[PDB]
């Protein structure tokens, strides 16, 4: 019914139940107690699309693809400013350098790329310098980032990182159940702090850092616990755009 | 004493095995389910919390109770973190200090700095948790705020104007911290889902689906106002007056549930009343009346000086105590010497304490020299004490109200707990929402049936009067089938009588298929309900005035007890036959005499072994004959041989049947004393008047429905200067008795020494333990939460052959419809206490719940004036067409005296206790403009008789 | 013929598990919004309270509180579609119709959707159940041409 | 145990004969010298007070402990009113409610609303005595204030910057309610007269005769910091 926060397992099964999609706390897991208090297995489509293949074609085959920890094939969705967009299904270990400079050419505009955002708006902004970073959960989660549903957009040099860092919080604000404070108020205050940063204030950046940290460590779900990542990444990777 | 009382612990208390954990260097042992926060609380180590309360289940909104745990990544919340063995937690690390500071910063960035000019200063949980963490600066220059009336460039669209619609509390959202302790409480505790969170995110605002609280589905219980930390939802008495300093534990003067309150006091001025989180009757919950309606004590209409008349036609005379008592005693002695001691009588009040009741029954027995005493019990729940006496041996309840927590089925005959006993209905719904099943045998759709998130439910919408036919059919169903417990019967009950009972009930004439014609309930539904009741492991019967107040009340109660005995739903938590007592201390009044056939302790008056003890203790010769009952009193007075009467805390005119006859009998009475707070309907025929005392100025006890003895404390000072027991002893000594009581402790000691059960009762006990069930002797010192746990009281239950007899109040051509009389949540029985409050909003006029199809033919429309042409009188009332009632049935209310409803009521009554037939009366509802010939005369009399000089 | 439609809808969704959301979808699809005169019957037939039925309607964005215009124009505002110039399309289009983002009217209603799946086709829009991609500054001409 | 420990009584305890008096319907027996306020405290009936402490002798500054006494004209102060035999006093009449409201109004008209972000939140005697009396509005649109850093047309001449010279306590006069429980304590209890009231009237400000506390004749005993109700000395 038009809510990005209903993708969370708890909020999802809360929306299924006929109520409003407010994220629940997690003393009980949905597995133990979920839909109508009864155990429920809640999974993504890509995970429930490989199950048949896995059980039929042999699990030992599906384990062949991937790195040491991550095993299997993943689709990489490539959109935004990019010549050859679409979908690339392949095994982990591939560098986004190859995926973004060789496979899918460059940009549609013909300009270079300044940003490559893995994951949705809950994902860091990986620049050209990170082209030597292969696609796997552990290494990306280690190198200050996130790889989820393999989302991958592209931005060229004519993009403003300030606008995007602001959009991040604007999103976290418009998309928010309102259960816990660090997203209720945190986001709509960060959206102001970013404007202040745009103005030129110096008492905003450390303020922003503290806000982001409390958001990370306090927010109930990841919509307000990973929202800081876009911001901090755009700030530490592209400082030539943030006065 | 327990900490759950003084201290607000974080989360609800759980049942489980002992788990040991270390909270910030302090060893702790708590059940497994118990959270980290509650354990830390129990350990003395307090962790900051704003959105977590004991009343409701924890939610991760505040993020202020974060704690660093070894083995867990990040800073998890204690409220939503269940304890584990050997867990070492760190409450206050530097990082956590910083994070909590940040969160409070984000709060206060959207909060007005109206501290120091706000209602909840010193009683706000945001202010102390903002000072606790140590917030020293807010760095967020906020442009988007909810409180700012005027934003840049103009009005703030977020700003929502205050709501003062409800006369008892106000909703200022400008200060709302969305935590939803209002929503959670209204939904989990009260059970009426009238509050929600409209919006998504920062735009989220608490709101009822209506313009104002009053127009919504809010019953005014104040559980949101009690659980709101930040003055958003606030009592108006705290706005007008300052925040209170001290607290005193008292109880409600209503409903017989005995909700234990703490009055918050600022000097002597009662600021507010808030539940105590004590008493198994209410675990921190209440309703409109007890919570808010306490302003009758501070009303201008209250009478504060004695008044003597010498003739009803003559005006009053404000007078001191001495000569008032002198005149009273003189007239009394005259009438006594002339017509005898049996020409007197008293009418005790349940509304009063049990000490005062004891003094009054003494005054009637020792002093006057008669057994002519009585009480409200005689029009309500007197048949109960006959039935449960004939069957079990105790004229009282069988279980507490915590038992319902363990029930698995609830069978409700003739009750409406959503109005009558709201705090019981709350804990009922708490279970109904948790799977338990429900059967409702009322002829009128009750709001308990339409509760939200309800499980299964059956509704036997029968015809008023046929209440024993249905029970008999249930029994026939259970006996023709074989579902009953034979082990239970063979162990706790008798078999030889059971065989006869079964051979009788097994007749195919008392079957559900034959009663459908006279009863009106379907057969299949009835069979299903019976099977469901019999099959369930722990079922429980709750009954009220739909069984007792009829031509056959004791019979119905006996049938119900037969059911409960047969099925095996006795002697265990979750099962029992509970009558829902009404007024406070009805149980205590009945226990302390208040009956013309017994002494304190349900001991008959003809008992020589008892009369001896009492003559020995009082040093006076008593009578062995049972006394008259109110109907008998009035019939006599009409016939003569009855001249005096001392009405204590009762309205014998408005709150009794056949207003005409009772008035005629109250008039032919040389002396009728009145001892109420206000000038009443009964005081229109009075010759004397003695002021009284409220429960705030009193000191003593109340014995509620579950046999619980709650303690009543003095918070104010008597405005008349004397409490009710003081006035009673005044009168008694003025007549010649010679009592000397300076405190009700001596009185309770007397009671203990005289009757058993209260033998171990002492105010110290009541203070320490808090509450006691009156069956408390040297055996069972702590109390008896459950009765008949080990064999019945008489020794063996008794199965009685109940049968359905056609009522004499059948309907005919000129009286086709039927009638019923009931209640509302806002107003109390006669509303002498409640009409003098702001509860005239929800109910300011009594109305007639007629059926639509029974309205079209007559020409009635909602809001029209109609007349109730009955046999025993006539009245006029404002109509209300509703599909709530069945066709050929009507429902009135008696809260307001402007409409004389009990003039329609007939003299027909029960056979044993003569409890009137309030719930059946053949009427005729027609359309009319002129109110009446009776109401006019009543108004005239009341006007010409309530004049003071 | 409102009560009739509503009763039919509720009968169609009788006995389901968590049937509030579907019932509300169907209601919105029928009329165009969730009328306040239909908060009570739903609650009754489902055993809920007006409050919850209102909260559910409030939380979710797809449930209109008032009707839209004869036409509707949803326009992504997410990262990808932003990348390839959604702002320009937005400006052009809102100048064409004269209605800013979120600003509705009786003619049209311009709003955000934040994704349509047309991420590769970065500039993406939803005009009256018709998806459109690669919305250059020329396609807007046809967008408005078929859209008076 | 004694109440002098847990509860801050109004005035110092006196030696004398037993005197019986009725405080708001409560019988009380206290030495002759003992004041009305201390007796009311001993009786459980609390009367609002801000400038009276047990450590020092009472002064009639706050005017918040006013009580209506039979036989006395007007509303005299309990702190400066010695008990007399048979005296019947009324702690809370309507008029007194009104007057106390007015006085707290006049206070808060010159006080910053830094509650909720101040050091003495929950331990301030101005806040609880402002909530106790029941202040709900301030009708004085003040232009002359001590706390306002910037006044109309520029800097406030009354504003005195904070003093953090002493490593143990700080003096923020912006929140001072002149009551002089600091002066009184430093002079009567400690015995080193290092604090005074510089100025006459509204311009009166607490001060030591020196730029900062450290340079003065202050030995750091914290008897001012203990007796300061309003976080000025904290
Ligand atoms: N049509 C119809 N009539 C009915 C009934 C029905 O169901 N339908 N129910 C019957 C039953 S259930 C009963 S309980 C009665 C109840 O109704 P009543 O027996 O009339 O008792 P109350 O409503 O308390 O008011 C009676 C008077 O006592 C005064 N009083 C209250 N508290 C005190 C106190 O603490 N001290 C003193 N000295 N006086 C006090 C009240 O202010 C009031 O003036 O009504 C009966 N009449
Ligand atoms: N707010 C509030 N609380 C109260 C009171 C009040 O007036 N206001 N009254 C107090 C008093 S003293 C009383 S006694 C108690 C008890 O109060 P309850 O036990 O709740 O009794 P009532 O509400 O009078 O009505 C009982 C229900 O059964 C229905 N009924 C009618 N005839 C029959 C019949 O023949 N068979 C069956 N099975 N049902 C029938 C009635 O219509 C009604 O709905 O509550 C106390 N609490
Ligand atoms: S971070 Fe935001 S969306 Fe997530 S649970 Fe908290 S309030 Fe809801
Ligand atoms: S609710 Fe509490 S924090 Fe908010 S203004 Fe009132 S007293 Fe201050
Ligand atoms: S007063 Fe009671 S019923 Fe009304 S909103 Fe508050 S909690 Fe709910
Ligand atoms: S009204 Fe009170 S309890 Fe409800 S969300 Fe707001 S602050 Fe919390
Ligand atoms: S009327 Fe009954 S439920 Fe309400 S507060 Fe009094 S005792 Fe409790
Ligand atoms: S001193 Fe007291 S009243 Fe003044 S700002 Fe601090 S806490 Fe508030
Ligand atoms: S700390 Fe200094 S100024 Fe304060 S009372 Fe002690 S000596 Fe006086
Ligand atoms: S510094 Fe403190 S004690 Fe001294 S006058 Fe000011 S408020 Fe009173
Ligand atoms: S403090 Fe436990 S979550 Fe609110
Ligand atoms: S992001 Fe706009 S198309 Fe998916
Ligand atoms: S209160 Fe006694 S004078 Fe300050
Ligand atoms: Mo009753
Ligand atoms: S009663």
Author numbering:
A (entry chain B): 251 to 493
B (entry chain A): 7 to 955
C (entry chain G): 2 to 149
D (entry chain E): 7 to 240
From the paper:
To solve the structure of the functional RcFDH complex, we subjected the as isolated, azide inhibited sample to cryo-electron microscopy (cryo-EM) and single particle analysis. Subsequently, we generated a 3D reconstruction with imposed C2 symmetry yielding a final reconstruction with an overall resolution of 3.3 Å as determined by gold-standard Fourier shell correlation (FSC) at 0.143. The bis-MGD containing active site of as isolated RcFDH structurally resembles that of oxidised FdhF. The EM map around molybdenum indicates six ligands coordinated in a trigonal prism geometry. The two remaining coordination sites are occupied by the Cys386 sulphur and a small ligand that is oriented towards Val592. There is no clear evidence for stochiometric binding of azide in any particular location of the EM map. Two tunnels can be identified in RcFDH starting at the molybdenum and separating at the active site residue Arg587 into different exits.
One of these oxidoreductases, the metal-containing formate dehydrogenase, catalyses the following redox reaction: 1 CO2+2e−+H+⇌HCOO−,E∘,=−420mV In standard state, the equilibrium of the reaction favours formate oxidation at the active site Mo or W atom, which is energetically coupled to the reduction of oxidised nicotinamide adenine dinucleotide (NAD+) in cytoplasmic FDHs e.g. from Rhodobacter capsulatus and Cupriavidus necator. The RcFDH complex forms a 360 kDa dimer of FdsABGD heterotetramers. Subunit FdsA binds the bis-MGD cofactor, which coordinates the Mo atom in the active site together with the conserved Cys386 residue. The direct electron transfer chain between bis-MGD and FMN of the heterotetramer measures 76 Å and consists of five Fe-S clusters: A1, A2, A3, A5 and B6.
